[PDB]
Amino acid sequence: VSFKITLTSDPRLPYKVLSVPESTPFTAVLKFAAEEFKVPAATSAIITNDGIGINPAQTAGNVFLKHGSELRII
């Protein structure tokens, strides 16, 4: 599965596209995205477009199924 993750704290709203196995934990996606954007992995969070936090203790496939592939990192 491909996630498009947008960093909102940079006003240009850069995004990265990440390819992740469905059964990989979403914790890994949060970590990778944080690394890609050079933001601290331990304080960062992935949210929906309404600002709701995604609990990363679930598979990437589950997150895609429930909330789609376009998310934001804060």
Numbering used by the authors: 4 to 77
From the publication, what sentences describe this entry?
The modification of proteins by ubiquitin-fold modifier 1 (UFM1) is implicated in many human diseases. Prior to conjugation, UFM1 undergoes activation by its cognate activating enzyme, UBA5. UBA5 is a non-canonical E1 activating enzyme that possesses an adenylation domain but lacks a distinct cysteine domain. Binding of UBA5 to UFM1 is mediated via an amino acid sequence, known as the UFM1-interacting sequence (UIS), located outside the adenylation domain that is required for UFM1 activation.
We determined the crystal structure of UFM1 alone at 2 Å resolution. The crystals contained two molecules of UFM1 in the P212121 asymmetric unit with RMSD of 0.14 Å. Superposition of this structure with the UIS fused to the UFM1 structure did not show significant conformational changes (RMSD of 0.49 Å). Unexpectedly however, we found that the interaction between the two UFM1 molecules in the asymmetric unit mimics the UIS binding. Specifically, the spatial position of Ile 55 and His 70 of UFM1 overlaps with that of UIS residues Ile 343 and His 336, respectively, which are involved in binding to UFM1. In addition His 70 of one UFM1 molecule, similar to His 336 of the UIS, enters a negatively charged pocket on the surface of the other UFM1 molecule and interacts with Glu 38 & 39. Using gel filtration we have found that UFM1 exists not only as monomer but also as dimer. However, in the case of the E38A mutation that prevents interaction with His 70, the dimeric form is not seen, suggesting that the dimeric interaction is mediated via His 70. To address this question we superimposed the structure of the UFM1 dimer on our previous structure of the UFM1-UBA5 complex. As shown Fig. 5D, binding of UIS to the UFM1 dimer positions the dimer in an orientation where one of the UFM1 molecules within the dimer clashes with the adenylation domain, thereby preventing activation of UFM1 dimer by UBA5.
